[PDB]
Amino acid sequence: ARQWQPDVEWAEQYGGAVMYPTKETAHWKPPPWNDVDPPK
Amino acid sequence: MNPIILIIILMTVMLGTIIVMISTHWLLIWIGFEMNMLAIIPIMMKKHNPRATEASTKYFLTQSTASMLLMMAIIINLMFSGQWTVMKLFNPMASMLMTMALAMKLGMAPFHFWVPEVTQGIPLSSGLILLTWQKLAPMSVLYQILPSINLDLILTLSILSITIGGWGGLNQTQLRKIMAYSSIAHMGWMTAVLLYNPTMTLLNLIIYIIMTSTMFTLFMANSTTTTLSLSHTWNKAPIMTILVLITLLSMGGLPPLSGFMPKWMIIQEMTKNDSIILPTLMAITALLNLYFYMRLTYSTALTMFPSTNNMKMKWQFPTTKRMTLLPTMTVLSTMLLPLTPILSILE
Amino acid sequence: KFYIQEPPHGSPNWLKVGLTLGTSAFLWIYLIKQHNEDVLEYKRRNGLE
Amino acid sequence: LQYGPLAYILGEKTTKKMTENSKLITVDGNICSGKSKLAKEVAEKLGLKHFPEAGIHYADSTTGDGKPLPVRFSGNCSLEKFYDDPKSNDGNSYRLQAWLYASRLLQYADALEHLLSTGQGVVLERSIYSDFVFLEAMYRQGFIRKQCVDHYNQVKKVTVCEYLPPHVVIYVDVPVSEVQSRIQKKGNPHEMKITSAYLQDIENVYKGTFLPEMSEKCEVLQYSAWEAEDAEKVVEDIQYLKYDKGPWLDQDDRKLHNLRMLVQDKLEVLNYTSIPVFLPEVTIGAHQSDRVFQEFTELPGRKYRAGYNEDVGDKWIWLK
Amino acid sequence: LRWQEDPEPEDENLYEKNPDSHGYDKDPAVDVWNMRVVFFFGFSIVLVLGSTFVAYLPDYRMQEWARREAERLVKYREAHGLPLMESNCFDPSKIQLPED
Amino acid sequence: MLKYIIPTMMLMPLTWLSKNSMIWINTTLHSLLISLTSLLLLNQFGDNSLNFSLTFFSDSLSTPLLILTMWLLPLMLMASQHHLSKENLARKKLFISMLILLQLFLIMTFTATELIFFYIMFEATLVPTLIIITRWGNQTERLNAGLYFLFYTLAGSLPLLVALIYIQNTMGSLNFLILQYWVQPMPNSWSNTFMWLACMMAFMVKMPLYGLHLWLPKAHVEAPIAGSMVLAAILLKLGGYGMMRITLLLNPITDFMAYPFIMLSLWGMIMTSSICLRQTDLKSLIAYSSVSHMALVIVAILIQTPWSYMGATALMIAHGLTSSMLFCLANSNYERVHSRTMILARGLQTLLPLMAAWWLLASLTNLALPPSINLIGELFVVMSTFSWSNITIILMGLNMVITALYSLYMLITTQRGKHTHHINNILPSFTRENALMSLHMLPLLLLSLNPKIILGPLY
Amino acid sequence: MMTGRQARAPLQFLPDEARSLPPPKLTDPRLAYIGFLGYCSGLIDNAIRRRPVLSAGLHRQFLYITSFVFVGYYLLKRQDYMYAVRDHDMFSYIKSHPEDFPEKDKKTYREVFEEFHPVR
Numbered sequence A: 001a002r003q004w005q006p007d008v009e010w011a012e013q014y015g016g017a018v019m020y021p022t023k024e025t026a027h028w029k030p031p032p033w034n035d036v037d038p039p040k
Numbered sequence B: 001m002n003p004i005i006l007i008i009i010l011m012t013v014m015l016g017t018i019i020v021m022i023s024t025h026w027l028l029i030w031i032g033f034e035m036n037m038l039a040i041i042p043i044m045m046k047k048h049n050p051r052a053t054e055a056s057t058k059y060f061l062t063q064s065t066a067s068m069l070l071m072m073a074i075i076i077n078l079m080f081s082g083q084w085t086v087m088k089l090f091n092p093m094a095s096m097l098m099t100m101a102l103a104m105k106l107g108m109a110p111f112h113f114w115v116p117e118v119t120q121g122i123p124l125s126s127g128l129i130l131l132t133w134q135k136l137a138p139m140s141v142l143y144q145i146l147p148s149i150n151l152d153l154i155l156t157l158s159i160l161s162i163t164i165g166g167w168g169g170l171n172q173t174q175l176r177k178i179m180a181y182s183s184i185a186h187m188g189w190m191t192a193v194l195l196y197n198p199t200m201t202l203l204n205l206i207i208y209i210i211m212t213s214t215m216f217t218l219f220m221a222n223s224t225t226t227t228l229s230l231s232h233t234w235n236k237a238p239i240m241t242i243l244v245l246i247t248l249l250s251m252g253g254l255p256p257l258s259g260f261m262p263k264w265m266i267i268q269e270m271t272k273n274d275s276i277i278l279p280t281l282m283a284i285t286a287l288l289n290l291y292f293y294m295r296l297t298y299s300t301a302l303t304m305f306p307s308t309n310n311m312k313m314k315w316q317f318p319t320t321k322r323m324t325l326l327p328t329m330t331v332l333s334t335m336l337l338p339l340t341p342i343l344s345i346l347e
Numbered sequence C: 001k002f003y004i005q006e007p008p009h010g011s012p013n014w015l016k017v018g019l020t021l022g023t024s025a026f027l028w029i030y031l032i033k034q035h036n037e038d039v040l041e042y043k044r045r046n047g048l049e
Numbered sequence D: 001l002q003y004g005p006l007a008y009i010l011g012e013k014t015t016k017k018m019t020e021n022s023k024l025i026t027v028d029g030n031i032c033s034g035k036s037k038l039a040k041e042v043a044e045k046l047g048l049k050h051f052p053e054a055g056i057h058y059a060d061s062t063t064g065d066g067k068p069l070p071v072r073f074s075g076n077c078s079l080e081k082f083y084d085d086p087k088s089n090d091g092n093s094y095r096l097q098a099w100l101y102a103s104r105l106l107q108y109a110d111a112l113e114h115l116l117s118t119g120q121g122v123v124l125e126r127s128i129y130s131d132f133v134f135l136e137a138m139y140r141q142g143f144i145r146k147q148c149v150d151h152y153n154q155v156k157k158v159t160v161c162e163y164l165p166p167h168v169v170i171y172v173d174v175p176v177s178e179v180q181s182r183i184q185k186k187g188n189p190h191e192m193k194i195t196s197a198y199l200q201d202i203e204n205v206y207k208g209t210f211l212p213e214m215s216e217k218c219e220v221l222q223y224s225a226w227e228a229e230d231a232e233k234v235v236e237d238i239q240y241l242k243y244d245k246g247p248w249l250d251q252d253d254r255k256l257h258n259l260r261m262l263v264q265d266k267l268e269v270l271n272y273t274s275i276p277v278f279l280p281e282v283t284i285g286a287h288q289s290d291r292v293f294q295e296f297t298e299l300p301g302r303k304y305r306a307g308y309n310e311d312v313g314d315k316w317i318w319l320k
Numbered sequence E: 001l002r003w004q005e006d007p008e009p010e011d012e013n014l015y016e017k018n019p020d021s022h023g024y025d026k027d028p029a030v031d032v033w034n035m036r037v038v039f040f041f042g043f044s045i046v047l048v049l050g051s052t053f054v055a056y057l058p059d060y061r062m063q064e065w066a067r068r069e070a071e072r073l074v075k076y077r078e079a080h081g082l083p084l085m086e087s088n089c090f091d092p093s094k095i096q097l098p099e100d
Numbered sequence F: 001m002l003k004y005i006i007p008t009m010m011l012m013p014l015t016w017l018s019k020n021s022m023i024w025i026n027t028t029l030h031s032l033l034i035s036l037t038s039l040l041l042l043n044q045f046g047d048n049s050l051n052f053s054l055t056f057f058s059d060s061l062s063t064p065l066l067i068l069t070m071w072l073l074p075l076m077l078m079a080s081q082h083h084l085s086k087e088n089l090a091r092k093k094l095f096i097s098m099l100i101l102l103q104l105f106l107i108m109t110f111t112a113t114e115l116i117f118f119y120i121m122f123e124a125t126l127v128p129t130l131i132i133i134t135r136w137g138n139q140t141e142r143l144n145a146g147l148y149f150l151f152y153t154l155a156g157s158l159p160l161l162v163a164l165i166y167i168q169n170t171m172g173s174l175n176f177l178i179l180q181y182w183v184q185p186m187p188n189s190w191s192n193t194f195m196w197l198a199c200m201m202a203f204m205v206k207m208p209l210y211g212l213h214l215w216l217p218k219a220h221v222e223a224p225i226a227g228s229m230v231l232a233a234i235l236l237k238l239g240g241y242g243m244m245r246i247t248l249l250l251n252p253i254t255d256f257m258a259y260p261f262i263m264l265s266l267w268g269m270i271m272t273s274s275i276c277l278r279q280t281d282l283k284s285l286i287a288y289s290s291v292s293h294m295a296l297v298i299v300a301i302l303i304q305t306p307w308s309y310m311g312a313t314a315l316m317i318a319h320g321l322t323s324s325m326l327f328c329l330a331n332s333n334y335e336r337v338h339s340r341t342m343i344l345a346r347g348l349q350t351l352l353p354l355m356a357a358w359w360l361l362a363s364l365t366n367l368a369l370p371p372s373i374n375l376i377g378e379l380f381v382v383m384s385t386f387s388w389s390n391i392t393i394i395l396m397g398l399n400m401v402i403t404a405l406y407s408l409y410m411l412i413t414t415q416r417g418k419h420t421h422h423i424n425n426i427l428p429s430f431t432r433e434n435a436l437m438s439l440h441m442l443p444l445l446l447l448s449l450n451p452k453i454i455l456g457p458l459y
Numbered sequence G: 001m002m003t004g005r006q007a008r009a010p011l012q013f014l015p016d017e018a019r020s021l022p023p024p025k026l027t028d029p030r031l032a033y034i035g036f037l038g039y040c041s042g043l044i045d046n047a048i049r050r051r052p053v054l055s056a057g058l059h060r061q062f063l064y065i066t067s068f069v070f071v072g073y074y075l076l077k078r079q080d081y082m083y084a085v086r087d088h089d090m091f092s093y094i095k096s097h098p099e100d101f102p103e104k105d106k107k108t109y110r111e112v113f114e115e116f117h118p119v120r
């Protein structure tokens, strides 16, 4: 009855490394938050 | 970084761009590009993480290859003309090599393969320096050699840049890669009007630098590097959602906004020269840029994505950031279209 | 007294207010002087007096 | 503003005031270790500034009038409902833990800001380096999920890497039976519902994970219950330390300048506490966030910036 | 319990807390004055004075004039033996045709 | 026209400097004053348009669209103040500002003497409309509605920009007053064929054409009520206004290039009307009726006879009032049952009798009951298309059957039959709602007394 | 286009011949719009720093307005100069090349034959 605003199911579409995940772009995890990688 | 060293390195980046802009000799153009690259590499490695080192390596390799092709074009001009004046080139081979070199330095497609990588790897401030200030020296040299630029080459580079920069940003959720494919499409727009009216090239460059500086200043003021973190801005500073709304609708080329100003004028100069198909394809292909801009406005301004609990702490703290010229650039990037005949000052 | 800490903007920075008003007054008087000089030079170069 | 790169250029080096009194000291211990006076006692011997332990309302105490805001504006959580219903459906446990981690991050930023601006050392109680032991005790007791631990580890991984450890970490050995005796003598009816296994897990993550990884990057001082009653012995052991471990020794003016430029900006400190990881304990939906944000704006002294509020008595707004 | 959320509120009735409601605002004084504003500047000003304005338009697009002028011109060319209208709009003397 | 642009602009401080309870009253009052002032545009002459300046003029085509535009704004403010009652004050002022800015763009879209200023205002009307639909819409599909609304429009209009700049470079001016006297015949060539398509497809999208109409039943049902009223009442008529301006330049190629676009309309008004026989959603039924009625305006512009233009402009004004009233009535049920399903709430003449009288009058003006200006426009289009081809009366007359068969079906499904037992929040009609219905219907009925002011530049 | 004009006198924002032109009025609506841009910048500046938008920083809003009017006055001077240069070079090129611009003999519509295309 109120206005629709996006939920977690809608908002997790924009959280991947890409927007349209294909077979090649499937192992791509999103980058780190401070963009700093472990030193390995 | 030590701030004296940061001041000296940024003044050296500026000095390299100015040495390209003011000099009448080809060796000094090349020295200015070398100084610009050499000084901007520590701006990219300001944070010392592997992504900045990777971005700096890719940027060094692309810009060094471009500067090699630039100096070969300069030496072939020296052979076929016996002189060094920065003007038209006296050989189509040197013209092709210098157009390739400047297209690599701009990151125009199909040499575009470094701009999303390098732009994602580096911070937002150095990404702003990359996408705005580094688009001034090759556009100077392109403004100076346009009697010798091959028409088919610069138009192929331009429309290929517009198409690839349109399709690239649709698959992105990272804001820096969005701004990088936006850069590719806009450099295609600038170089397509280069041989017809280079005043429109300078107009598109200035309006683009205003809008891109607005968007990076909004990203830095909100501390957002992804789409999904930009989507929390309504719960923290809701005026910033309005500013990114008006600036992203401006960057898509929508009237009555100032980002409609270059595009229209470019079409206005390409239909005079009996080219109807090419600015039509360019305008229709700019709808892809508009589509991922509209995606960012949906996630940020027009809807309200769910936030977290810890945002309640950030309600109690204001921004102490230097949002330098952000209201000025926000006004200039949105409300400048009634001042459209100001472009005559760029003649 | 309300705030538990003294804010950075509790008192107006009177040096910065003085610089702001002085700069704005200088730009207005220089603009009006420039415009009067420009209309006088137009009327001199075209004899429209 | 007050500090920036121009102040660093014009001579304000932050090791010109770094004296031997500039020691960041964090006192740790179990739930009723009796450290709560001990830290203050250290702060009345060494001449240091005591910060109390960050509750839910520490950010309320640093901003505005300093009074605690209502809990729907700060926290959206309760320690007493965690003591009553730890396995609750609304996810109060990890929501309380995430808010307390953000509050301790803010307190540690305030501590480093005082230490690097004034040169006076700060005595903290349970800093961010010791906040994870309550998370791990809650996870061993099954109060939270593994996704909550992963969210905490991501936030900690991207926030604690930019800070320094304390110079001195003081730990107080109090056994579980003595903790329970002091809880029963405390009189708090919610705090008496703490299980024995939760206290034992706090002590285990202390002695097995916290102190063996902090003994390399700072100097532990592990006391028992009776010898922590005498503050003179503890301060005498502090004053005769040989500060040689940890990354405080290789800190020049430039690194501490970069740290001070990070630390004084509180929205950059709290930048990664609200990462877009949609976890049901901490994700507040759109309409509730809009409602609580618009109710927060209507509070006195919260509608504008901290010197621009006519309803609390700010004058000369038209010249600010 | 996914995405912590305010429950969806009930449908509020303006007649319960105000049985004299006009439907404009929950404040009854604002409601009655919004009703008076809508009815006065909507019906007493736009509709009544607008219908009076459109009813007395000064010869809208000259359609009365065009009749009255026609009542002159027919009366000029009935009496002088002229036809009431020529098939040519313009004088055929002042038109050069393309030769053939 | 600067006596109308500046009051519309001054509605921005009037909505942003008001008290927190007076912002609907002040904007309604002063927009009703602007609507009363809009009648000074009726200084029209039988030979010359009312030419104010180098920038703005108003003939007898733009004048009814302007009076309808400046009249629609208080009506949108009355419709929109109920479902934005719990709204934040700042977002409430932003919504009122988008309506004010949209009115400001429309009233100098219709008066733009020069065609690229017409293009800039014509495509500037997207952004407040886009923000209204995608921000103050109700459901999930308002974002897809905004995307379809934006990208059919710009796909149609970005060739229009290139075509107008071609006319600017070839003729020398896009002044419509100069182009009445410097118009050259556009010959038969492929260059002139795609010239015609670039000049027409933008307006074919915004009318909408059948086949390109797919943006509209998404953009009408997902908009809020002020958005639905402005898309129904005005924003479809930008296409008709632009066609009636731009077909001056497109002769004589139109006489063989309008053939595919008449068929698509003459069959498409059969199809969309047929769609209205089976629509479960009431607001979608009103949307497909809007497509069905604007197909006649497309036919009437493309056959370009005088009776067709007179019927098309009368039909545009009449359909604007009627469809705006129909969306307001559908909103009056949606504010009580909170669902747009037409079979949900039935028998509503037993519960809301006066509102059922408003439903009856709006349904009669939908089915073109004489002597309403709906029937005047409908009838004159049918006359001119019988002059075009005598067989078209079949496709006309069959449509006038089906237009009745959903106008009364909507009346019988919503208002008649046995009422729904399990729905009991059916409140009596508010004075705001009955005032809104009367401010739609009473001008629509008074225009039957004097239709000559809504019959275009060639009455 | 006009790049060879401003090459004998380089980096002159306003040349000497630009003083032979009437300057923009201070009530120029273009200049009033640039001042309105300055006021909108002042409002956005008070908005993003969460000041009261109309009341706080009237000196700062006034320096925004003053700075935009001051820059925009010279920008309008250079704009009007460059369009006057465009027209001067146009007219001098038409005058110096009469063979490229023949005087057209505008025939009246009694000799001009246009094909009538009936709309029926």
Ligand SMILES: CCCCCCCCCCCCCCCCCC(=O)OC[C@H](COP(=O)([O-])OC[C@H](O)COP(=O)([O-])OC[C@H](COC(=O)CCCCCCCCCCCCCCCCC)OC(=O)CCCCCCCCCCCCCCCCC)OC(=O)CCCCCCCCCCCCCCCCC
Residues within 6 Å of the ligand: E047, E048, E051, F353, F354, F357, F358, F360, F361, F364, F365, F369, F370, F371, F372, F373, F442, F445, F446, F448, F449
């Ligand atoms: C410039 C000055 C002009 C002055 C004259 C006015 C000119 C026309 C203006 C509009 C007239 C109609 C307005 C009333 C209907 C709407 C309200 C309503 O529900 O009424 C029921 C209600 C009485 O019912 P109730 O028992 O109290 O309770 C209601 C029931 O619960 C529930 O109600 P119900 O079920 O009992 O009633 C439903 C029933 C349903 O009955 C029908 O639908 C059957 C009638 C229509 C079909 C058959 C006739 C077709 C046309 C032929 C007649 C016209 C041409 C004749 C000329 C010769 C041949 C060419 O409605 C009627 O009988 C209404 C009679 C009038 C119908 C007019 C045609 C509307 C049909 C759709 C369009 C048709 C083509 C356009 C016609 C345009 C005429 C100008 O009426 C009122 O309370 C009247 C209030 C005041 C109305 C003022 C109207 C004028 C306002 C203009 C203001 C500005 C100018 C100043 C002049 C002011 C004059 C006083």
Ligand SMILES: CCCCCCCCCCCCCCCCCC(=O)OC[C@H](COP(=O)([O-])OCC[N+](C)(C)C)OC(=O)CCCCCCCCCCCCCCCCC
Residues within 6 Å of the ligand: E046, E047, E048, E049, E050, E051, E052, E053, E054, E055, E056, E057, F035, F063, F064, F065, F067, F068, F071, F317, F443, F444, F446, F447, F449, F450, F453, F454
């Ligand atoms: C315009 C485009 C936008 C559309 C929306 C507009 C919204 C803004 C609204 C502004 C105000 C309204 C504008 C339109 C005004 C229309 C009215 C108008 O001007 O009329 C002029 C016409 C003018 O008639 P006229 O043109 O023949 O008069 C000659 C002109 N004068 C007056 C100068 C000599 O008014 C009338 O016809 C009035 C006649 C008398 C009143 C009505 C009598 C009939 C009533 C019923 C009698 C019985 C019939 C059978 C009934 C059976 C039951 C149903």
Ligand SMILES: CCCCCCCCCCCCCCCCCC(=O)OC[C@H](COP(=O)([O-])OCC[N+](C)(C)C)OC(=O)CCCCCCCCCCCCCCCCC
Residues within 6 Å of the ligand: B274, B275, B276, B277, B280, B284, F152, F155, F156, F159, F162, F163, F166, F191, F192, F194, F195, F197, F198, F201, F205, F212
């Ligand atoms: C809404 C969805 C469908 C959209 C359809 C839009 C209209 C369809 C046709 C558009 C054509 C492009 C604009 C034409 C402008 C004509 C200007 C002019 O005078 O041209 C003469 C000129 C002729 O050249 P000239 O006139 O300069 O030459 C000098 C004169 N002569 C000929 C004597 C030498 O035409 C052209 O140059 C090309 C015209 C055709 C263009 C073909 C490319 C575009 C193909 C169609 C694209 C349609 C939209 C695609 C997007 C769909 C959705 C994603």
Ligand SMILES: CCCCCCCCCCCCCCCCCC(=O)OC[C@H](COP(=O)(O)OCCN)OC(=O)CCCCCCCCCCCCCCCCC
Residues within 6 Å of the ligand: B123, B125, B126, B128, B129, B132, B133, B136, B202, B205, B206, B209, B210, B213, B217, B220, B321, B322, B324, B325, B329
């Ligand atoms: C045809 C040739 C035309 C030549 C025109 C030349 C005009 C001037 C130069 C314009 C070129 C682009 C300028 C911007 C380059 C980037 C500057 C930059 O990155 O500065 C760093 C700084 C970072 O901010 P901070 O938050 O402190 O950083 C945290 C740690 N990094 O700050 C920032 O990142 C904030 C942004 C500061 C600069 C933005 C404002 C200047 C450019 C916008 C247009 C201004 C209008 C006047 C000029 C118009 C033409 C561009």
Ligand SMILES: Nc1ncnc2c1ncn2[C@@H]1O[C@H](COP(=O)(O)O)[C@@H](O)[C@H]1O
Residues within 6 Å of the ligand: D030, D031, D032, D033, D034, D035, D036, D053, D079, D096, D097, D100, D131, D134, D135, D191
């Ligand atoms: N991260 C945490 N999670 C749950 N409770 C905590 C946390 N940190 C501190 N506390 C509580 O804070 C109180 C500290 O005890 P005291 O020594 O009296 O300050 C005890 O009730 C602890 O359980």
